[PDB]
Amino acid sequence: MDTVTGLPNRQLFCDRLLQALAAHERDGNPVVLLFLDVDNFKSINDSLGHLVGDRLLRATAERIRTAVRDGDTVARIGGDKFTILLNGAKDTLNGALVAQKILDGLAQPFVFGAQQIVISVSIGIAVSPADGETMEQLLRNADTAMYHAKSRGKNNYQFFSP
Numbered sequence: 001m002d003t004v005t006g007l008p009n010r011q012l013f014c015d016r017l018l019q020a021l022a023a024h025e026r027d028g029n030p031v032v033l034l035f036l037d038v039d040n041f042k043s044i045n046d047s048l049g050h051l052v053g054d055r056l057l058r059a060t061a062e063r064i065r066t067a068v069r070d071g072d073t074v075a076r077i078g079g080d081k082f083t084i085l086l087n088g089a090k091d092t093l094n095g096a097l098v099a100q101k102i103l104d105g106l107a108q109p110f111v112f113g114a115q116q117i118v119i120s121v122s123i124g125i126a127v128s129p130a131d132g133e134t135m136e137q138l139l140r141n142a143d144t145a146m147y148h149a150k151s152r153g154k155n156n157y158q159f160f161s162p
Helices: 010-023 041-048 050-067 096-106 135-152
Strands: 032-038 073-077 081-086 110-112 115-117 121-127 156-159
Touching: 010 073, 010 081, 010 135, 032 050, 032 096, 032 135, 041 050, 041 115, 050 073, 050 081, 050 096, 050 110, 050 115, 081 096, 081 135, 096 121, 096 156, 121 135, 135 156
Parallel strands: 121 156
Antiparallel strands: 032 081, 032 121, 073 081, 110 115
């Protein structure tokens, strides 16, 4: 597992995603991938030090889990990004309602001692199969949507556009 966050390894996430894509390919309960970026993490980690930085990453990972559904998988990547697998997103409007719940949870302050921390977040979303069939295509597409979102603002989300 990821020592910093306690989240599943990249390998386990990978295994989880492959299985979900095999199990859910119906338009009514598709696999949806969210790629989350803690936009201002570097400045925080630099200013406050890695001790606080790691604590923040772990608190962010847990809040993300509280906002997804039991059965979904969350894993860290690239230091300050998180790949979120929605294992059958029926009734979530292709993950949009999950992305909104995450943003609501992450908009709350992270208090470390007397230091209030507010992170800025950007989420890219990719829906199978329209946004990719393979896990690599889905992830890369959610990643692209993420950076697009980040370029246009903060505390936002957007779906990949073919």
